[PDB]
Design an enzyme around this catalytic site. Structure first.
Site, PDB file in Angstrom:
ATOM      1  N   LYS A   1      -8.125   1.919   3.536  1.00  0.00           N
ATOM      2  CA  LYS A   1      -6.919   1.643   4.327  1.00  0.00           C
ATOM      3  C   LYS A   1      -6.735   2.545   5.561  1.00  0.00           C
ATOM      4  O   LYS A   1      -5.897   2.269   6.433  1.00  0.00           O
ATOM      5  CB  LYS A   1      -5.678   1.715   3.429  1.00  0.00           C
ATOM      6  CG  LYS A   1      -5.873   1.107   2.049  1.00  0.00           C
ATOM      7  CD  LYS A   1      -4.836   0.038   1.785  1.00  0.00           C
ATOM      8  CE  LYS A   1      -4.604  -0.190   0.294  1.00  0.00           C
ATOM      9  NZ  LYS A   1      -4.646   1.071  -0.487  1.00  0.00           N
TER      10      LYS A   1
ATOM     11  N   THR B   1       0.834  -1.195   0.000  1.00  0.00           N
ATOM     12  CA  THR B   1       0.000   0.000   0.000  1.00  0.00           C
ATOM     13  C   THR B   1       0.905   1.297   0.000  1.00  0.00           C
ATOM     14  O   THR B   1       2.107   1.171  -0.192  1.00  0.00           O
ATOM     15  CB  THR B   1      -0.975  -0.083   1.221  1.00  0.00           C
ATOM     16  OG1 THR B   1      -0.823  -1.355   1.852  1.00  0.00           O
ATOM     17  CG2 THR B   1      -2.413   0.074   0.766  1.00  0.00           C
TER      18      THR B   1
ATOM     19  N   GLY C   1      -4.069   4.318   9.849  1.00  0.00           N
ATOM     20  CA  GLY C   1      -3.847   3.820   8.507  1.00  0.00           C
ATOM     21  C   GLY C   1      -2.917   2.640   8.648  1.00  0.00           C
ATOM     22  O   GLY C   1      -1.920   2.710   9.370  1.00  0.00           O
TER      23      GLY C   1
END
Ligand code: ATP
Ligand code: ATP
Ligand code: ATP
Lengths: 173, 317, 317, 317, 173
Positions: free
Chosen positions: A33, A1, A45
């Site tokens: 996320k 990510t 996050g």
């Protein structure tokens, strides 16, 4: 990510894209996320492969809703649960947590890290790309912590093959 | 022969200031265990009390409202925090004080114990308040064993209706009124066995105590800390004035400490006062006949300051 | 009918030299359980004693100040280190030898074991000092199980207020005065369940004993080691002089040993003296009528020397 | 009304030959619990006995010197090796046969139930010797759990001073004299909780028994093995001579076995003798009126030889 | 990291840079690697990847504030907790501890090591570089133990790619 957090003018923003990668294929591309914790008092996050990434999230909640939302204390109480004789497994993931007061990065190995003077935090494969654009902006522009997070995330989606331009951003207050 | 809800509330608003829905649900719990009396035979031996579940912080008044409803309604009381049948054997040993102290100065020899063994029991089975503090501490998740769900199982025949065998006879429980409290910050009410969620219909949620709420609890309640010290220091032959601008700096100074450490609730006031009435309590006798003015200037330079520990600089890189 | 804090302090300064804030907080704990007497009905049955928490080393006087306040104030005493209700059943069994030790030597027949069933109870519910030594030994971290936090939970109904059922009747606890001690070197006071931190408002911190502090504890206290040996050796028909330049070399020689091994505290003096009064204690009878001068020269060549073990050269590369 | 240390030593040198500092420290332990009597009130109810810690092998006389000081000084005795309060309830049940046996064999009817529960407890609280064998077996390291340090904790109220409740009444312990023994080969004295190292000031170290020391223990002690067999075989109508050159070959033949197997100590002599007095003990009756000469020639060819097992050739490559 | 400790003229210094490395990237560059223990009585510098590096730090504290700050004894008491039947996990890190009296190096594997005659200690990737400059100076200059630690740390930051010139130094008394 790619998860990034900027803090400017009593503003705390935390953004992240939405690409769940499996191998070199994309399974889900909308995934949230960045989630909200403690009735909306703290931002979190995560990054590091679903499962562990999640159980790390939950464990930090069971620590906030047991310490009156005191970020720093909740963080350390959680970290200490790894630094003992009888470990707490080991998680392949890390979190960026922040409320009106402080902002942190907690790893499922048992450590808590505070930002550097500029108060910018990023994690995940696309991490440093966002952190590079963020510092670039914060230090050379007037943009709000939201605009910057927004801008920095895109710069990182265009370089990381595991990050997309489909992100979800949250800010405080 | 018992008060009205409107009155039970107003009589509670003197020792437990704050809350609201708290008292309300507790009131109608007593009022309807009496309305159960004026009924025939069928619609009377079957109508279990609508038990209560108090959801609130620590030190907000979950136990007070259960105690100031055991005396200000007079009935056997008992508090327990998770043997199980020995909770009834203690509710009976606490009933020998409203029949042997209520009928010793009233019905006044007269001994006949075989006479009070059905005058004491008839009581408990009717007037019985069992308080379970910290019930949330026995729910499914706890990350290893689930035997805490066994306690929640042995504590079932009671809230349901069985016959506990005490040293005074077979005392039924079917009509006892149970009240359970819990923080419920980690778990949720629904994390309790379904075979006991429907035996606690009343769900009342108490709120935490603010700055203003700590100001009132310091005086308005009967035997408040302001009075208790005014009296305990009057016996020394000393008078003491608790100005209003100094009560704010004690409520909004015991609150400042509950939002930077564990939130022990109202009990924070006791530890604050004890530090304030520290200078006086010692040399109070050796200062007979003096009216000391405890104001903002005194309170301020009475304790000092209380900033967070050091958390950071210790274990964080 | 009881002393003043100023006096309780001064009466303690004879057996427990040193400390300070220690006695002070303990004094006002007794003084205000009495001031609780001269009060009406409302402001009297509700005013729990401000319990104490003594934080200090080992052998500094945490237990002494709790004992010399059970006799020099006369009240049922008991020490316990983490059943729980059997702590009260022992506070009652220590009440008889008072309400029947002086009373039996005062009523002379007139037995009446029925009053020591309601007049010996007033001797507990009113005068009751429960001492919990090493309470820090039951806190959350301990690196595997947390059942030590269960003991801290069963020990809650007592410091709060319940009704323990002893063999003498239903003795209440609401007004008993609890005092808990702890080293608190590993843990912190705040590591105790919040639902009991506010039931111990008094926080007193005792200090360790220095070189000079060990010098005084050797003589000033009643029945000090200097006197105990002066007497136990006078019965042998021998007199012994403990010069001052030799008391320094016994306090600053029992201190030298506490900073190079476990710091057992004052109890280090006993093991030091026993090595000094070793040569004399044996052949004291066979040396009747002699005044031995124990000075710097004698003490020096009486024990020898005590350097650290060998730690290094053994397991270190 | 009690002996002098010089005499307690000399009276012990008849059953327990060897050691030295062993007896000495044990003697002054008794002598000074008596000197405690001739004192007023203050310097008398407070002067705990200087407990003893015997550090030595196995079978050197750590238990003997504690037993031959329970009879040769007469006082309730008891040995225990790590309930805890049932150590006192047994010291009392061993203080009965010194009243309902002794006080009926000096001052011979005269029962009086309420007279033995004051004539016996006054004997325990004063004359009380509790012996703890193998105390080193409860120290911190043991490589998994440390609950052995819990026993060392429950065994604390006793060596300190509490009130054990026996079936004869409340017997205090404050003045009882405790003696603990230990091999202390793996651990060290300092491996015991500091809150109990200062409650055992006397540190006496016993030595092991050599070849010559085994020679003497075979005859000099009252009821020695040489005598016990001379008598147990005289009843059969047989006389037996234990020459000196044959006592050496029994002491330096039971020592040879202690340095090639477990060192059981003096108790090795019993198993050696039993093999020697094996041929005679059986057919002693059928050989009435005979003086057998047990010399070097007999002892030699009486047992055989005892070389090490096989250790090596079995599990070593 | 580079952690070095020199001792000259009743002086005990302990320095270390401040670079937290993740892969070949730099996450934090100010980090305090040398902390104070027992009310300021002992100095401790760690190396070996946050988590373990920390839990090793804590464990030596729970041993100092349980032995009156007796460095050597606390050290060995800690070491022995690894050399038993039931091990104490295994830590990927090591410490350099020193008070007015002694100075040591404790590894999370269960061993305690005393310096060599010159009384110089260094650990971490930049270790030997500092240790080389230290010995160089101690043996050929008059510089104080502080000046030396300072100088040696820089020499090591310019050779190790995991060591920076942003250091924190502590000394006793
Ligand atoms: N609403 C209130 N008004 C006045 N005093 C209060 C109130 N709530 C709590 N207190 C004070 O709190 C103390 C008792 O605490 P209590 O047992 O009521 O707390 P709880 O939250 O019900 O229990 P727990 O902490 O066991 O969950 C008393 O000193 C009482 O005065
Ligand atoms: N301040 C003091 N002055 C004189 N003697 C003292 C003092 N404090 C302790 N002692 C001595 O210590 C012994 C009792 O120890 P004490 O019960 O006071 O220990 P403590 O401080 O309560 O520690 P712990 O409870 O952890 O053992 C007695 O011999 C007593 O004379
Ligand atoms: N010096 C001795 N003189 C005479 N008999 C002795 C001597 N030492 C031991 N014994 C004999 O040993 C037996 C008792 O052993 P004891 O209990 O004293 O052993 P210990 O040294 O205390 O060791 P442990 O307590 O470990 O068994 C008795 O039969 C006693 O006669």
């Amino acid at each position: 990510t790619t998860i990034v957090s900027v803090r400017r003018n009593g503003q705390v923003v935390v953004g992240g894209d939405g690409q769940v990668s499996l191998g070199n294929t994309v399974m889900k591309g909308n995934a949230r996320k960045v989630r909200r914790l403690y009735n909306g008092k703290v931002l979190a996050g995560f990054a590091g492969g679903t499962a562990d990434a999640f159980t790390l999230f939950e464990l930090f909640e069971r620590k906030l809703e047991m310490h009156q939302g005191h970020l720093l204390k909740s963080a350390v109480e959680l970290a200490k649960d790894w630094r003992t004789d009888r470990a707490l497994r080991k998680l392949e993931a890390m979190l960026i947590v922040a409320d009106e007061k402080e902002s942190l990065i907690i790893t499922g190995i048992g450590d808590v890290v505070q930002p550097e003077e500029d108060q910018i935090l990023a994690i995940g494969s696309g991490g440093n790309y966002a952190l590079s654009a963020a510092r670039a902006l914060v230090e050379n522009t007037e943009l709000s912590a939201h605009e910057i997070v927004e801008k920095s995330l895109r710069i990182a989606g265009d370089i990381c093959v595991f990050t997309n331009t489909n992100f979800t951003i949250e800010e405080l207050p | 022969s018992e008060m009205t809800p409107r009155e039970i509330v107003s009589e509670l608003d003197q020792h437990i200031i704050g809350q609201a829905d708290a008292k309300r649900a507790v009131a109608i719990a007593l009022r309807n265990r009496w309305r159960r009396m004026q009924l025939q035979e069928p619609l009377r031996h079957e109508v279990t009390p609508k038990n209560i579940l108090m959801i609130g912080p620590t030190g907000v008044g979950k136990t007070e409202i259960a105690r100031r409803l055991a005396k200000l309604a007079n009935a056997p009381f008992i508090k327990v925090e998770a043997e199980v049948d020995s909770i009834i054997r203690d509710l009976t040993d606490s009933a020998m004080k409203l029949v042997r102290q209520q009928e010793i100065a009233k019905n006044r020899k007269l001994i006949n114990p075989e006479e009070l063994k059905q005058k004491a029991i008839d009581a408990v089975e009717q007037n019985g308040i069992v308080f379970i503090d910290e019930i949330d501490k026995i729910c499914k998740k706890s990350g290893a064993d689930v035997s805490r769900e066994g306690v929640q199982r042995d504590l079932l025949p009671l809230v349901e209706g069985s016959t506990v065998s005490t040293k005074h006879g077979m005392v039924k429980t079917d009509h006892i009124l149970f009240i359970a409290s819990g923080a419920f910050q980690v778990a949720r009410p629904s994390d309790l066995i379904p075979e006991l969620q429907g035996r606690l219909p009343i769900r009342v949620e108490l709120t935490a105590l603010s700055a203003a709420d700590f100001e009132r609890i310091l005086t308005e309640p009967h035997a408040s800390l302001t009075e208790q010290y005014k009296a305990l220091m009057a016996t020394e032959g000393v008078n003491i004035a608790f100005t209003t601008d100094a009560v704010k700096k004690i409520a909004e100074a015991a609150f400042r400490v509950n939002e930077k450490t564990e939130n022990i609730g109202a009990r924070r006031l006791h530890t604050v006062m004890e530090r304030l009435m520290d200078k006086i309590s010692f040399s109070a006798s050796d200062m007979n006949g003096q009216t000391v003015n405890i104001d903002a200037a005194y309170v301020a330079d009475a304790l000092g300051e209380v900033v967070e520990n050091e958390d950071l600089s210790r274990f964080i890189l």
